[PDB]
Design a protein. Structure first.
Ligand SMILES: [Mg+2]
Length: 278
């Protein structure tokens, strides 16, 4: 932690495919910035009617977060499982596994970094929520929270079971008393258990994928990391954003307001939020 937070924001925004987005990231109280993001409206080479947005919360360095931000989408869309809902979901799963294996082979990783990843792939008919770690995506529809991804915490029943089966333990709500997420990309020190596949390791790169039919009543999706969700609940943040959209249509601005509000509520983390309005 710094003595004084770096409150400078990086912002971006864009529009297309019947969406508008804004985003904001801030280093905040932490000594390093290790978050990254992806915002693609109109996926090229065939997926022009689709969009993808993601937030990556890095730890023990930026290297994994940064690489995901510019390569995960490629890994998802170009594998043989991706190339129907079934196939999209498998393609996403395959992309996560292949990037985790690929990154492992870089000279610096053979660097101890890891990253969460949360995203949405938006098609003309479906939203695919994607989660790996304790970042979170939430959908607001018809004036209510409609959907939330499930945070991957070591204390969760099935996460604890896998961890125990891999010879670890959950102590102080952390993997072997150190890692505060039970799923992530990178973190290779937690993926060296003999006799276990990639998805059976102390920390798993397997994402959970939730597909949701799109509705005319869809209002917005929020993607943010635990530095936001730590101080605001799903309903609390949705209602906040809703109240801000009442006075501003500048999504960068709205996102900056969210981030500053969470800082004032005491969040000492790096923070990244992406707001996608329909
Ligand atoms: Mg964080």
């Amino acid at each position: 932690f710094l003595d004084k937070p770096k409150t400078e924001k990086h912002n971006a925004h864009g529009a297309g495919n019947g969406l508008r987005y804004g985003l904001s990231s801030m280093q905040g109280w932490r000594v390093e910035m290790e978050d990254a993001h992806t915002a693609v409206v109109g996926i090229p080479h065939g997926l022009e009617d689709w969009s993808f947005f993601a937030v990556y919360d890095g730890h023990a360095g930026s290297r994994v977060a940064n690489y995901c931000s510019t390569h995960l989408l490629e890994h998802i869309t170009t594998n043989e499982d991706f190339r129907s809902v079934e196939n999209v979901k498998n393609g996403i799963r395959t992309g996560f596994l292949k990037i985790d294996e690929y990154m492992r082979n870089f000279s610096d990783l053979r660097d101890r970094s890891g990253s969460t990843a949360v995203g949405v792939m938006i098609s003309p008919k479906h939203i695919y929520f994607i989660n790996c770690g304790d970042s979170r995506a939430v959908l607001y529809r018809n004036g209510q929270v409609c959907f939330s991804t499930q945070d991957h915490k070591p204390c969760n029943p099935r996460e604890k079971e896998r961890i125990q089966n891999a010879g670890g333990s959950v102590m102080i709500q952390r993997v072997n008393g150190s890692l505060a997420v039970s799923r992530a990309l990178g973190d290779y020190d937690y993926k060296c258990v003999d006799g276990k596949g990639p998805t059976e390791q102390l920390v798993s790169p397997e994402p959970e994928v939730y597909e949701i039919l799109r509705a005319e009543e869809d209002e917005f999706i929020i993607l943010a990391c635990d530095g936001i969700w730590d101080v605001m609940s799903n309903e609390e943040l949705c209602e906040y954003v809703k109240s801000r959209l009442e006075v501003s249509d500048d999504l960068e601005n709205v996102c900056n307001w969210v981030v500053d509000t969470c800082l004032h509520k005491g969040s000492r983390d790096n923070m990244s939020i992406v707001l996608v309005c329909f």
